[PDB]
Design a protein around this ligand. Sequence first.
Ligand SMILES: CCCCCSCC(=O)SCCNC(=O)CCNC(=O)[C@H](O)C(C)(C)COP(=O)(O)OP(=O)(O)OC[C@H]1O[C@@H](n2cnc3c(N)ncnc32)[C@H](O)[C@@H]1OP(=O)(O)O
Ligand SMILES: CCCCCSCC(=O)SCCNC(=O)CCNC(=O)[C@H](O)C(C)(C)COP(=O)(O)OP(=O)(O)OC[C@H]1O[C@@H](n2cnc3c(N)ncnc32)[C@H](O)[C@@H]1OP(=O)(O)O
Ligand SMILES: CCCCCSCC(=O)SCCNC(=O)CCNC(=O)[C@H](O)C(C)(C)COP(=O)(O)OP(=O)(O)OC[C@H]1O[C@@H](n2cnc3c(N)ncnc32)[C@H](O)[C@@H]1OP(=O)(O)O
Ligand SMILES: CCCCCSCC(=O)SCCNC(=O)CCNC(=O)[C@H](O)C(C)(C)COP(=O)(O)OP(=O)(O)OC[C@H]1O[C@@H](n2cnc3c(N)ncnc32)[C@H](O)[C@@H]1OP(=O)(O)O
Ligand SMILES: Cc1cc2nc3c(=O)[nH]c(=O)nc-3n(C[C@H](O)[C@H](O)[C@H](O)COP(=O)(O)OP(=O)(O)OC[C@H]3O[C@@H](n4cnc5c(N)ncnc54)[C@H](O)[C@@H]3O)c2cc1C
Ligand SMILES: Cc1cc2nc3c(=O)[nH]c(=O)nc-3n(C[C@H](O)[C@H](O)[C@H](O)COP(=O)(O)OP(=O)(O)OC[C@H]3O[C@@H](n4cnc5c(N)ncnc54)[C@H](O)[C@@H]3O)c2cc1C
Ligand SMILES: Cc1cc2nc3c(=O)[nH]c(=O)nc-3n(C[C@H](O)[C@H](O)[C@H](O)COP(=O)(O)OP(=O)(O)OC[C@H]3O[C@@H](n4cnc5c(N)ncnc54)[C@H](O)[C@@H]3O)c2cc1C
Ligand SMILES: Cc1cc2nc3c(=O)[nH]c(=O)nc-3n(C[C@H](O)[C@H](O)[C@H](O)COP(=O)(O)OP(=O)(O)OC[C@H]3O[C@@H](n4cnc5c(N)ncnc54)[C@H](O)[C@@H]3O)c2cc1C
Lengths: 385, 383, 385, 385
Amino acid sequence: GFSFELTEQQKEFQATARKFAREEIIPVAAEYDRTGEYPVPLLKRAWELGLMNTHIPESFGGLGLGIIDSCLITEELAYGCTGVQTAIEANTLGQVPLIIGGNYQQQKKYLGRMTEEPLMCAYCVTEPGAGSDVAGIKTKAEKKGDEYIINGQKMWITNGGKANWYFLLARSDPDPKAPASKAFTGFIVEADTPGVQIGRKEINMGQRCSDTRGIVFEDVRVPKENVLTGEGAGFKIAMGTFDKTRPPVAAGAVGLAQRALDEATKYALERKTFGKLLAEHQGISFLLADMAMKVELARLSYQRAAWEIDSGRRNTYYASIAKAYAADIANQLATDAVQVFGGNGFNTEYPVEKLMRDAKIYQIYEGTAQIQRIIIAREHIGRYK
Amino acid sequence: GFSFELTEQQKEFQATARKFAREEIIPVAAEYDRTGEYPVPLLKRAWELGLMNTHIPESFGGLGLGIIDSCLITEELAYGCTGVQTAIEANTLGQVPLIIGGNYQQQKKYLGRMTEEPLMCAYCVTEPGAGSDVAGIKTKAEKKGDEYIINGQKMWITNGGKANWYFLLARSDPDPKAPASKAFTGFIVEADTPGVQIGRKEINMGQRCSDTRGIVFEDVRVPKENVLTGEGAGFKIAMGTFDKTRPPVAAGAVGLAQRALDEATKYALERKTFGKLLAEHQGISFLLADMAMKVELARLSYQRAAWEIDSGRRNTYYASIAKAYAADIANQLATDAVQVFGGNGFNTEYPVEKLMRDAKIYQIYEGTAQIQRIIIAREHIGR
Amino acid sequence: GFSFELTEQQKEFQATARKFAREEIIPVAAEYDRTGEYPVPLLKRAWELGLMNTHIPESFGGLGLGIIDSCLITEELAYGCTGVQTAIEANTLGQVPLIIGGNYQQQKKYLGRMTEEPLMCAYCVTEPGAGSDVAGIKTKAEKKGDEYIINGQKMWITNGGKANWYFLLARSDPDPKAPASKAFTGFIVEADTPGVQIGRKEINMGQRCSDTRGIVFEDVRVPKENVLTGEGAGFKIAMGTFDKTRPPVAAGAVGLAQRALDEATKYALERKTFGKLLAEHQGISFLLADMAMKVELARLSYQRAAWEIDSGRRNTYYASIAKAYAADIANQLATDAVQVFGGNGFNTEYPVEKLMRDAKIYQIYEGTAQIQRIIIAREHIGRYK
Amino acid sequence: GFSFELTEQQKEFQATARKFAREEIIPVAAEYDRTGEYPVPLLKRAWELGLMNTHIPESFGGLGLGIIDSCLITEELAYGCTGVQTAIEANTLGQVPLIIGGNYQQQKKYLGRMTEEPLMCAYCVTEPGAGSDVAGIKTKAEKKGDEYIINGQKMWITNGGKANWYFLLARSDPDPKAPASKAFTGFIVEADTPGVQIGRKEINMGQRCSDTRGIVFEDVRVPKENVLTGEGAGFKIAMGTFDKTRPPVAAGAVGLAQRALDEATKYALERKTFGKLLAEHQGISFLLADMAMKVELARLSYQRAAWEIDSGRRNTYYASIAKAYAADIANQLATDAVQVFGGNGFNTEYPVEKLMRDAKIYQIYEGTAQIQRIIIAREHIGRYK
Ligand SMILES: CCCCCSCC(=O)SCCNC(=O)CCNC(=O)[C@H](O)C(C)(C)COP(=O)(O)OP(=O)(O)OC[C@H]1O[C@@H](n2cnc3c(N)ncnc32)[C@H](O)[C@@H]1OP(=O)(O)O
Ligand SMILES: CCCCCSCC(=O)SCCNC(=O)CCNC(=O)[C@H](O)C(C)(C)COP(=O)(O)OP(=O)(O)OC[C@H]1O[C@@H](n2cnc3c(N)ncnc32)[C@H](O)[C@@H]1OP(=O)(O)O
Ligand SMILES: CCCCCSCC(=O)SCCNC(=O)CCNC(=O)[C@H](O)C(C)(C)COP(=O)(O)OP(=O)(O)OC[C@H]1O[C@@H](n2cnc3c(N)ncnc32)[C@H](O)[C@@H]1OP(=O)(O)O
Ligand SMILES: CCCCCSCC(=O)SCCNC(=O)CCNC(=O)[C@H](O)C(C)(C)COP(=O)(O)OP(=O)(O)OC[C@H]1O[C@@H](n2cnc3c(N)ncnc32)[C@H](O)[C@@H]1OP(=O)(O)O
Ligand SMILES: Cc1cc2nc3c(=O)[nH]c(=O)nc-3n(C[C@H](O)[C@H](O)[C@H](O)COP(=O)(O)OP(=O)(O)OC[C@H]3O[C@@H](n4cnc5c(N)ncnc54)[C@H](O)[C@@H]3O)c2cc1C
Ligand SMILES: Cc1cc2nc3c(=O)[nH]c(=O)nc-3n(C[C@H](O)[C@H](O)[C@H](O)COP(=O)(O)OP(=O)(O)OC[C@H]3O[C@@H](n4cnc5c(N)ncnc54)[C@H](O)[C@@H]3O)c2cc1C
Ligand SMILES: Cc1cc2nc3c(=O)[nH]c(=O)nc-3n(C[C@H](O)[C@H](O)[C@H](O)COP(=O)(O)OP(=O)(O)OC[C@H]3O[C@@H](n4cnc5c(N)ncnc54)[C@H](O)[C@@H]3O)c2cc1C
Ligand SMILES: Cc1cc2nc3c(=O)[nH]c(=O)nc-3n(C[C@H](O)[C@H](O)[C@H](O)COP(=O)(O)OP(=O)(O)OC[C@H]3O[C@@H](n4cnc5c(N)ncnc54)[C@H](O)[C@@H]3O)c2cc1C
């Protein structure tokens, strides 16, 4: 029947991820946000504390956990700082294409080193001209003998200048008439090969400690043994990846929303106005209630989406719903938390202005709020005929 | 482990309820809404179909179903007509106070009689001067011999004019500072007793075939044997009830929303404007997506609150979140369903305007949206 | 300079409409909502009290008033019952096409008799298969000598079976490739002419006492003397009628909204729960404040739309904003008004459940919420190019 | 009657501030934001152009303008940067207390020096333990002979470390049971006085170039001739000031919102996805339309609030609504302007992310969002008794 209970093993990872978040990530989050420095120390702890590369099949050294677990751990991380969390989750995002679109050797080779040493990887789809419109990417790949020459630009790549290797999507069919399901190719490209030119670190409003940047691929030579499933199967792999990784993303948002809620509540029991605590004012009580309600509902949506794909079924529908809802309520709670703090909440000495800045990104990456509505609409309507 | 899978027994109960709603409730819900006559026929078919009193334990002829099971059946019902469905649920609301508060006799006596024949009971707590402030009711009760003389009135009682027996909250202690947790007493009262003056059928905006009205009690006499757990445990029996009834009530609102969503979606795939199908205009697509999203979230919220109580764990927190949310998105989905229909949506010859009129009630009874907030804040600032 | 002051004369019109609405309309609107009976008695009294046909030029016996004036009166009327008000304001809608699109003769004939006798007229554009898309209408008009043969059907026509004459829009050019600006013609059709088959009174959830029904035109022969400006200038006239007529509609929703606010406001100061008036519960205070806020803002927007057209400038941008907003908040206050009444609110013995039923239509007729956004988006974006 | 036409004079002011704003503020706004450096060059410049101290009576060298005028000017300014505009507007805030509560001598002395040289002043009410609850301030003032000894702490003071003179609200009656309308007194304090300790500069999320800080007052001696109207008239002077300064703060929000709307529009007319310009996608056009709708309504509201006070009528009701609404729609428009920009919108190399960090303050200062509801609710209930 129905069950919202956790296995004893899951309650274990959760306790571990939680401790690590409230004891290690939280005391340093404020400083990494200010200095925009890559959180190398924290990424190593998470590595030896088994909180990273969770999805890598144990057939290569991984724990072989499932999307339910990734979300479970990720929510505890995001609670500390989604900046560190995004860098961590970026690894899963880049690995997944290999897990569902790669052969044994490719996984043994690129996934195996991830469990052996604390390396990082990245997902390369987005370009300057196209992001939401994946079908419009212009980065190319031509075959020369047993190789592929790759030329193009990638923009906004997470872990972009810190990855050992990259998952790269490039158009292989020059014919403009070529359909999306046959014009692209997923390649696994090592970062040190001659031709990849890493750009500068972009400076964004939130998740500052995270490394995000552009990359130029100029006459990059990739050996044929590096094409994932085959020339022309890149798009499906890309789509499959998003369904697998959108749930954990949505989980990151609820993690951020939780943080907002706890802060808002803690302060609401300390500050007094007109003779009573902020929480004793019905106005504020309803605000707090409406916040809690939303975090619970967003957590349910991602659990449902994770479970679905984990059970082996296509979860595009539930996945998008969770991403959309969690993203929107993550922002709503971020600003309401700042709100109950009054002037103090607008100040950097307090923890909430950072939350409002980190939150905006959830409505944009891994499919914007709009694109998610296009997906949900296309799946919902497909059911009526 | 995590699971959102229904058991074969539930995929069976559900198939039955869905059939009863799609094929039998839906082709007549329209006329019952217009006329407003208590849909006795449908209530007989529900009963003899197992879809009623679904909570009475086997020991008395009932199926002894759980809260999760009850919500799965309700959603399918409401999807047809929340008017008919509310008639049905008003039954388990009058029953639960007996299941959780009454002794074997009382239970065998009044619950057993419900499995033998298609009878109806009612829950009487609300009065004219108090609905939300449940601790403020005035219906009195004074003991005399092995009897309690009850005096007072109630209002908005569902199945009030169609009930065999009533669960009834009255104030036993006449002391002002009497601690709420000892000032009230619950009673299972029979409709045929002297002094029970039933009122006219109250006419409302939605859920019109349902029976709702005021009941005045004047010197009604109740034998101490009908006093539920004991003289004074009233407030506790009444409160403990909500923890079981709220989940189903939210699943009802979700069924309505599911119906509205379906109607609007089919129409959008039929009506054409500007050389395009309504569903092809990005503006409408987004509307549809947001509606889908809200239905799926409201559904999960009640499943969570049900599973919580079915597990023996107190579920006030999750229950109120499901009730609060489901009520809101049911009203929002009703108005948007009317919106996609256009002029037709505003018309009586179409199915959507009824939904909009029905929905509104979910924000009012069984604890208003405002009261649901007060509870969610109390429980949250409690964890 | 800026002024939100009413001229002494406008202060008079308002006081008339107000008294009329609160002493004569309110006392009987509930029965009319029930019976669905045309409110002839109230229309008669509205006519003599000078509250109707407000826009007809003095040249033809009218008050010569303007849109700002037309709105001030409507809001007061709507406060009583938008069912009655929509019946009255429908006359204005049907009259505008003549006032801005006809010659002296046409205006003397049809506009003139409205000042002498309490007749009613109607606006016939919407068909069963095309409403939001006026360029979609399929009722044709054919030139047979010095006459026009009209054939087609119209749906949802206010004052549809109570009108003396009708303004009708019919495609006059069969060429499917013909521009909408050149393919239509507006006519003036007298109801008694042979061929006009009036349908049944339609039953609706709200504004129940207003006459709204379908109408078929079977070989109706209208004289060229009744063509508005010319053959092919019908689309512009209608577009021009909406900008002029949309503001009063908005002012109409503001009336309904103001009514809801008062009812709820008067109850909240009466009903007591948990030992306090509803009003003393901050949760309800804030609720009331938001309603007040929305009504004030909606009132301001229709005033800005009336002034713009009254100053001789095309007011499309402003009319749409006012209509869209007033409609959205008129619906929001209806359900919140029912909400503060609680149980009673859902009962037909209390005035608010009717408000909720009447309100929904403001988001549909005279341009649906969605179309308003299209128009607004068109006006706004044109200013950057 | 009704008018929405600017007098030829206001059209001049407006055109000047617009020019100054789009060609002098905008070009350097991003830099002052990144450094948080106080914009002295722009302030001296504004003072030169007459876009400052606008409300000072002309018999003191001032323009003698009104609130509506201040709102017209502030909106243009805020459009360039609400960081720069807040520094300017904070001057009016500090001056009003003298305008409505000081005698002739005090005004020529303090308001006079402002017109002769580009000085700055501040408003001192908020303390660290009380902001919304003005009646809860602890700063004490006692009368010793012909002077008052001031002791207390203030916090979040705009222009706090750049003021020549301060308006200070202190409690002059130790009797805790004394009414709020009799326990405070407003003093005008010179910053160079012994005992005034300026705090460091506080670092906030938005309006970073604005100067804001706390200030300690150790036994600050103040001549009795510096008491504004008299002992105990402090609450009313402060309350009276907020009614006049609330419309302007609201106008600042609609300026920031207008800036958001323009950037969003211009980008939607350039960025291309799925073969069309963003503005071509209906989901996006609808968003732009709603954004446009709010700005027009927010602007309309502060216009109504300014006009009511210039006319010599208590405008508490209208001021709070305009302030409450503009505040919200500014935050809504900010985050949605970032949305249309995509990943770019989240990047600091673009103008929108700054607009989002700045907008959040409008729901906090000059009376928080919740406090405005308390006022609107009360004024509203007052109309039913
Ligand atoms: C915290 C963790 C770290 C994260 C750090 S940030 C990381 C990142 O941001 S990664 C970048 C994210 N990129 C996006 O979200 C892009 C959003 N766009 C899309 O998803 C799609 O282009 C779209 C808009 C949905 C689709 O557009 P279309 O071009 O129109 O494709 P279609 O025509 O719909 O379909 C073409 C074929 O693909 C098949 N398809 C579509 N969806 C799916 C799914 N979900 N699974 C499998 N196959 C799919 C479709 O069936 C078509 O196939 P045919 O066989 O030809 O019929
Ligand atoms: C599908 C449709 C079918 C048709 C259905 S029509 C049927 C109906 O509409 S229901 C009848 C109408 N009545 C209502 O809606 C009441 C709504 N509830 C409320 O508003 C309550 O005031 C409240 C807000 C919930 C509570 O307010 P309070 O006055 O402040 O009391 P509490 O503090 O909650 O409780 C005090 C004592 O109650 C006990 N308690 C509290 N929570 C619980 C739970 N969860 N389980 C059991 N007991 C509980 C508690 O023990 C307190 O007493 P003690 O002194 O500790 O013994
Ligand atoms: C009073 C209360 C009591 C009674 C209450 S109930 C009464 C009623 O319901 S009456 C029924 C109302 N019907 C509607 O609201 C329909 C809404 N749809 C529309 O407004 C238009 O189709 C549209 C969506 C705006 C336009 O769609 P399009 O087909 O795409 O036309 P466009 O391409 O935009 O324009 C084509 C030409 O028309 C000209 N045009 C458009 N707007 C105007 C205005 N405002 N003035 C002048 N001309 C206008 C446009 O310029 C085009 O022509 P050109 O050749 O370029 O000159
Ligand atoms: C763009 C510019 C650049 C700089 C930007 S940053 C600038 C700033 O931040 S300035 C600081 C802002 N702080 C605030 O806005 C705080 C909001 N709080 C309040 O307004 C009031 O405390 C309140 C909540 C409305 C009232 O609370 P109460 O304590 O409960 O007072 P009351 O008991 O309601 O009333 C007490 C007496 O005062 C009288 N009163 C109230 N309002 C008014 C007005 N508007 N005019 C005159 N008198 C007023 C009221 O009548 C009471 O009178 P009695 O004589 O005592 O009977
Ligand atoms: C911090 C950060 C980290 C990132 N990390 C990665 C990474 O690791 N790997 C990676 O591949 N990418 C990454 N990205 C890129 C991100 O996934 C893309 O930037 C985003 O999906 C790109 O879309 P766009 O910016 O082109 O937006 P566009 O959508 O093209 O334009 C902006 C607006 O257009 C709207 N829009 C577009 N098309 C439509 C339509 N048809 N209908 C309605 N609305 C529409 C969008 O909703 C949006 O609001 C990152 C971005 C950021 C900011
Ligand atoms: C950049 C900046 C510049 C400033 N400049 C100035 C200046 O020049 N002069 C000046 O005097 N002040 C200034 N301030 C201070 C501003 O006016 C105050 O910060 C604000 O009014 C302070 O409220 P608070 O921070 O104490 O909030 P508090 O309200 O005390 O606490 C936070 C929360 O409590 C809620 N709350 C409080 N009471 C109630 C109630 N009864 N009912 C419901 N909700 C309630 C609030 O809505 C809020 O969300 C500035 C602040 C900032 C951030
Ligand atoms: C169709 C229908 C069927 C019904 N069937 C039954 C039945 O079978 N049995 C039964 O017992 N009752 C029944 N009722 C009654 C329903 O349970 C009550 O109407 C509802 O709980 C009554 O509250 P009230 O109307 O007294 O509202 P009150 O709340 O007293 O007053 C109206 C408003 O006050 C607000 N409010 C009250 N207190 C507070 C507070 N402290 N803070 C903030 N806001 C507050 C509420 O949210 C509400 O909007 C039925 C009602 C309807 C409409
Ligand atoms: C009580 C009443 C009185 C009336 N009186 C009159 C009268 O006197 N004269 C008269 O002429 N008409 C009258 N009407 C008709 C009213 O003007 C029309 O019903 C309405 O404009 C018709 O549109 P539709 O119903 O065909 O809508 P349709 O648009 O066909 O369908 C409704 C849905 O489609 C959406 N939609 C359509 N096109 C698009 C698009 N391109 N993009 C996004 N969404 C879109 C709409 O927004 C809406 O939600 C009346 C209607 C009613 C209910």
